[PDB]
Amino acid sequence: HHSGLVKMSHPSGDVEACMVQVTCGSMTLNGLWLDNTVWCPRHVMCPADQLSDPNYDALLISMTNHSFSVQKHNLRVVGHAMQGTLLKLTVDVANPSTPAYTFTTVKPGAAFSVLACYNGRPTGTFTVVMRPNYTIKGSFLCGSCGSVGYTKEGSVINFCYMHQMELANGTHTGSAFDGTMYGAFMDKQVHQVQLTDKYCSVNVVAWLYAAILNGCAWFVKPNRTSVVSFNEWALANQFTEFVGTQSVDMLAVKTGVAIEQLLYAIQQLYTGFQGKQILGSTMLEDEFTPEDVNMQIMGV
Amino acid sequence: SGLVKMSHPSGDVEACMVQVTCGSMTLNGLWLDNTVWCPRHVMCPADQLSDPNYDALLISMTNHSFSVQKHANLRVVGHAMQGTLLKLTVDVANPSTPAYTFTTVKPGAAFSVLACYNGRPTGTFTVVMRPNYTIKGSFLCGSCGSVGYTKEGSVINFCYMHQMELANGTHTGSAFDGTMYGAFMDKQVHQVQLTDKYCSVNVVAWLYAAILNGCAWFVKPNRTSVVSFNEWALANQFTEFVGTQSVDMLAVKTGVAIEQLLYAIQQLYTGFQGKQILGSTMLEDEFTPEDVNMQIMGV
Numbered sequence A: 001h002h003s004g005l006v007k008m009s010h011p012s013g014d015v016e017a018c019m020v021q022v023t024c025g026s027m028t029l030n031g032l033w034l035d036n037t038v039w040c041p042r043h044v045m046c047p048a049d050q051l052s053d054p055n056y057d058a059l060l061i062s063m064t065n066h067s068f069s070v071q072k073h074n075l076r077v078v079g080h081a082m083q084g085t086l087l088k089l090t091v092d093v094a095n096p097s098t099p100a101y102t103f104t105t106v107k108p109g110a111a112f113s114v115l116a117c118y119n120g121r122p123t124g125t126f127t128v129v130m131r132p133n134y135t136i137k138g139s140f141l142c143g144s145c146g147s148v149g150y151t152k153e154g155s156v157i158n159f160c161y162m163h164q165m166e167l168a169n170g171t172h173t174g175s176a177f178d179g180t181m182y183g184a185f186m187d188k189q190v191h192q193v194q195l196t197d198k199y200c201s202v203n204v205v206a207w208l209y210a211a212i213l214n215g216c217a218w219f220v221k222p223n224r225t226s227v228v229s230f231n232e233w234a235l236a237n238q239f240t241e242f243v244g245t246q247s248v249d250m251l252a253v254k255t256g257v258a259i260e261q262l263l264y265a266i267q268q269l270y271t272g273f274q275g276k277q278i279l280g281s282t283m284l285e286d287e288f289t290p291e292d293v294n295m296q297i298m299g300v
Numbered sequence B: 001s002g003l004v005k006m007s008h009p010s011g012d013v014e015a016c017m018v019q020v021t022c023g024s025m026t027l028n029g030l031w032l033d034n035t036v037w038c039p040r041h042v043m044c045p046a047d048q049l050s051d052p053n054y055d056a057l058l059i060s061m062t063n064h065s066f067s068v069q070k071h072a073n074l075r076v077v078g079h080a081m082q083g084t085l086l087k088l089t090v091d092v093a094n095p096s097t098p099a100y101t102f103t104t105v106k107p108g109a110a111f112s113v114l115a116c117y118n119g120r121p122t123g124t125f126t127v128v129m130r131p132n133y134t135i136k137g138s139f140l141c142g143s144c145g146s147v148g149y150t151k152e153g154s155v156i157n158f159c160y161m162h163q164m165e166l167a168n169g170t171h172t173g174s175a176f177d178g179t180m181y182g183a184f185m186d187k188q189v190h191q192v193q194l195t196d197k198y199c200s201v202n203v204v205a206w207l208y209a210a211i212l213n214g215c216a217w218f219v220k221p222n223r224t225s226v227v228s229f230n231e232w233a234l235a236n237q238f239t240e241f242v243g244t245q246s247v248d249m250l251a252v253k254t255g256v257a258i259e260q261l262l263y264a265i266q267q268l269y270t271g272f273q274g275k276q277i278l279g280s281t282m283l284e285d286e287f288t289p290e291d292v293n294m295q296i297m298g299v
């Protein structure tokens, strides 16, 4: 029985209609056009010269509205401001296809969709999980900066990521729309070290519930570890603190298996499945959220 | 690794999705110009679903028997049946119709799916048409009429319309010429599904991806020719390998010949013996040569 658990993205049409190309002097990258505002990474101001230590405050003061051109794929720039690692440009036409939206900062273990773009043209979409060291996997080439990540609630888009960087191990990071870089990385072309990754406990738990729902509950036992005992165990064993949610509780009702029983299962499975499989895997999986499992397996 | 399950942006296709209702049944349709395509079992009452007479159902229908709703409503002015699909004609041409073709895909080909419910796009993912003509993905009740598609240039190729779930939880559907992949039938009955196989050309692509990422411990000078590997594939659950320009480009860039990777595959099939390739301990066959070119090179 194939599970039905797949990496699934939100439809990107609403976001595709907001993607533009932003150019400053020699550099070009993507931006997000919402109403009369265009968002993009501030390193579009940096010339290839000074990328290893740009003075962004200095670059900004050196700019005029005429320093920027936004091309859609006719937008005069009439304002420019900097917000953390982002530019907040103002243009004289409101995007007619602006969706309803909010901004959020995702937390580790949450998933979102990314629309990868090059020169203002959407080219691909995929789903990522914000890792406990605040990097993401995904696929991003040169020219992808300014690609955006988002979730959907209703037909409301929650914008949460704007792409900035590749890290040393090949993972990626970017800004939230308040200007802050996920993981405190600097938007400078300087070697930087990401922290060690961990297993997202709550996603692992959702995945075992997915397993149970699929008729694989061989790992379930009456044994229970409390959330508190687990969370102390987790410090020493490369797991995140478990945090319960309504979404997880609904999987426990549906299956009749308590979160504490799966916390115990994780302590045992973490040393290996000992020859057994779960959902065709020999390792614990943590890139499926409880929402994914409710939505994809129970249509909730 | 840099190699991920990546779908085509779905906006061009969202604009074409509608809901089609016929009596009790409701599902999704595809609205292109003055035509709305949908699975013909929208005509079947729940009761008669195990062996419908689609020919008799269609003659009993009038144009008012189909209701079509966008998320406006669209007046049906013609109805016809093409294999397992209905071809409805509506009096409004979809003003956001993309340039499109209807090409049937072959095993090993990957395409994007836009999963919809009651005419509303709700998710997108990428699947591989397996050698037994099934796909995986995620399809719940209400998902029939969801479409699979690729985009080459400005042109969308529509290649799949969702019809059913098999007993093992895989899925299958129609091409837009009205044929069902794998000649499954659009009847609610247990059906014999052929045995799966590894898609050899996709395994080669993935090995090239490994090479491109600095993981080449498995490459030897030894070679196995295409014809020899294909005789072996018959006995070991692999598809015939057929090269393409896209694979040739991976060979050019890495300097590793196809034939070296076919030898490697014959040896890696018995076990990696404690090694990993791109984080994996089994052969991966769900990424195409085109995927590897695009995601690791930009072609």
Ligand SMILES: *[C@H](O)[C@H](C[C@@H]1CCNC1=O)NC(=O)[C@H](CC(C)C)NC(=O)OCC1CCC(F)(F)CC1
Binding pocket: A029, A043, A051, A140, A141, A142, A143, A144, A145, A146, A164, A165, A166, A167, A168, A169, A172, A186, A187, A188, A189, A190, A191, A192, A193
């Ligand atoms: C913008 O399009 C581009 C996207 C990356 C290119 C390859 N993959 C990408 O995601 N962003 C950059 O090139 C940044 C620009 C700086 C001003 C932030 N730099 C960068 O991505 O590479 C330098 C890395 C090297 C690895 C590291 F971990 F050490 C950190 C710096």
Ligand SMILES: *[C@H](O)[C@H](C[C@@H]1CCNC1=O)NC(=O)[C@H](CC(C)C)NC(=O)OCC1CCC(F)(F)CC1
Binding pocket: B027, B041, B049, B139, B140, B141, B142, B143, B144, B145, B163, B164, B165, B166, B167, B168, B171, B185, B186, B187, B188, B189, B190, B191
């Ligand atoms: C249309 O929305 C629906 C989609 C499936 C519902 C569950 N997952 C799906 O992808 N398709 C159907 O309901 C078909 C209708 C027929 C007229 C084709 N039937 C179906 O998919 O389920 C019945 C299967 C169950 C397993 C089996 F081996 F017995 C074969 C029949």
